[PDB]
Amino acid sequence: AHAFWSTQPVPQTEDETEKIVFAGPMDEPKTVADIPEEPYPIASTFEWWTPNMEAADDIHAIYELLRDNYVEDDDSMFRFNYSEEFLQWALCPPNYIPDWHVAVRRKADKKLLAFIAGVPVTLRMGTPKYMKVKAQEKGEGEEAAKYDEPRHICEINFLCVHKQLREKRLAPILIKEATRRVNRTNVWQAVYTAGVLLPTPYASGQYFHRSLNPEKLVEIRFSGIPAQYQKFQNPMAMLKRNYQLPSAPKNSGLREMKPSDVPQVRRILMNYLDSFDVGPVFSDAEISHYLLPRDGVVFTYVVENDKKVTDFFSFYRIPSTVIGNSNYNLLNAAYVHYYAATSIPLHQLILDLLIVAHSRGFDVCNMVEILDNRSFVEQLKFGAGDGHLRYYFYNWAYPKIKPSQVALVML
Ligand SMILES: CCCCCCCCCCCCCC(=O)SCCNC(=O)CCNC(=O)[C@H](O)C(C)(C)COP(=O)(O)OP(=O)(O)OC[C@H]1O[C@@H](n2cnc3c(N)ncnc32)[C@H](O)[C@@H]1OP(=O)(O)O
Numbered sequence: 080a081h082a083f084w085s086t087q088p089v090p091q092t093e094d095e096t097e098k099i100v101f102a103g104p105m106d107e108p109k110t111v112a113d114i115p116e117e118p119y120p121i122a123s124t125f126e127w128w129t130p131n132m133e134a135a136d137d138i139h140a141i142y143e144l145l146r147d148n149y150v151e152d153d154d155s156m157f158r159f160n161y162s163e164e165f166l167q168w169a170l171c172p173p174n175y176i177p178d179w180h181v182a183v184r185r186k187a188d189k190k191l192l193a194f195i196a197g198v199p200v201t202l203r204m205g206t207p208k209y210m211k212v213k214a215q216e217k218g219e220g221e222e223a224a225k226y227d228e229p230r231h232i233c234e235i236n237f238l239c240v241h242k243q244l245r246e247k248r249l250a251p252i253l254i255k256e257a258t259r260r261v262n263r264t265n266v267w268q269a270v271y272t273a274g275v276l277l278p279t280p281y282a283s284g285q286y287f288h289r290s291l292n293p294e295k296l297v298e299i300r301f302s303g304i305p306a307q308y309q310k311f312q313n314p315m316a317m318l319k320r321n322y323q324l325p326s327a328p329k330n331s332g333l334r335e336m337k338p339s340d341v342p343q344v345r346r347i348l349m350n351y352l353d354s355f356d357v358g359p360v361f362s363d364a365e366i367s368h369y370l371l372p373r374d375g376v377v378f379t380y381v382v383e384n385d386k387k388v389t390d391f392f393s394f395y396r397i398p399s400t401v402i403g404n405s406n407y408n409l410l411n412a413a414y415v416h417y418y419a420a421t422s423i424p425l426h427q428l429i430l431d432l433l434i435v436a437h438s439r440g441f442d443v444c445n446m447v448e449i450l451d452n453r454s455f456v457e458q459l460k461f462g463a464g465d466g467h468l469r470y471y472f473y474n475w476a477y478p479k480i481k482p483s484q485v486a487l488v489m490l
């Protein structure tokens with residue numbers, strides 16, 4: 080039973096989702112004028128706050144809330160520690176709407192108690208390929224194609240309630256207020272991801288991890304040692320040897336991305352992403368924002384051949400607080416971001432990603448099995464993790480799809 084989610088325009092069960100054959104909205108059609116102009120009511124001791132996510136001090140406030148209260152693993156060994164610079168990057172893409180960043184503060188002392196963020200994204204979210212085939216068979220192709228045009232929607236992230244305020248039904252109030260503010264800007268769908276199972280995902284993928292600093296990963300109990308290593312006189316020396324990487328990239332003409340690369344990177348990325356059922360559409364400004372290198376935040380390299388960009392990869396940094404081990408403060412993780420290969424096999428491109436991340440002091444490389452991430456798991460010694468990432472839409476019926484049909488990376 081879901082006292083809140085049962086009231087929302089989402090499919091309610093897996094059985095319902097199994098029956099969906101066309102992409103389209105769930106809710107009654109509404110207009111901006113129908114939506115309350117006033118913020119959703121909240122208790123008198125609380126106030127709504129719209130942070131300025133280009134004021135250093137407001138970013139710092141959000142940073143502290145998330146550092147102390149955001150997502151942990153299931154054993155509460157690690158907690159995400161997104162940096163202030165990362166938050167500015169993630170929250171302020173081109174044409175972001177400041178009003179979509181929603182906070183709750185205690186009115187008396189302005190202590191930040193809760194947060195949710197929305198940013199604009201242009202998303203292809205029309206009926207998936209396998210369902211369009213069925214629609215053709217049945218003479219229903221017009222209906223199946225109705226919502227094929229890329230849609231300007233909201234991407235929700237960073238929902239967080241302070242630990243001291245948990246289980247008090249604040250999350251539904253945050254979600255309702257974010258929904259109101261987005262609806263007041265004539266936007267009616269959202270996309271979001273979560274580790275937890277909610278009604279009702281359109282896709283779900285396992286996490287994968289590639290050890291870069293295995294001695295540290297084992298120390299902090301991120302990683303275990305296969306029982307088979309006990310056949311060796313020295314399990315750990317063998318483990319280090321297993322995960323060893325070259326000191327320098329192998330692809331000649333790999334270099335960091337620069338601003339003049341933007342249009343070529345846009346073209347090769349967009350050509351690649353268009354093959355997936357669900358995926359973002361990026362302008363030059365959005366390619367520049369999401370992919371140009373930013374120290375400590377995002378790292379992007381291109382393969383240039385004959386003065387042409389033919390391949391690229393990107394990764395972003397999210398460290399996590401190591402909660403229970405006093406020997407290390409942080410786990411330094413690199414996450415596979417967008418990429419495109421046209422000249423070399425993907426495993427050869429992504430090896431250089433691992434090389435660069437290792438050289439820069441990263442402990443592990445993480446990803447979900449979206450895109451063609453499965454195509455280099457075995458060659459590059461990624462192992463499946465405990466975690467999954469579930470993909471959701473708000474106010475959008477969508478047939479179930481494999482995670483290898485999803486091309487949207489979520490930070
Ligand atoms: C058109 C525009 C639309 C815009 C909005 C689109 C929708 C966006 C939706 C948000 C996408 C976020 C994407 C991310 O950021 S995923 C990351 C979520 N954040 C964390 O996990 C951080 C650590 N945890 C917390 O801060 C709290 O435990 C949270 C805030 C998660 C819940 O707070 P609390 O534990 O104090 O509980 P409550 O009593 O206040 O509320 C209980 C209700 O909340 C439902 N719940 C629990 N977890 C989630 C979850 N991750 N997404 C959606 N709903 C969730 C739960 O089923 C229950 O509803 P119901 O079962 O009774 O029905």
Ligand SMILES: CNCc1cccc(CN2CCOCC2)c1
Binds near residue numbers: 152153272273275467
């Ligand atoms: C994509 N945005 C970050 C994210 C948010 C919520 C949940 C997750 C995935 N969890 C992490 C903890 O270990 C279990 C899996 C990731």
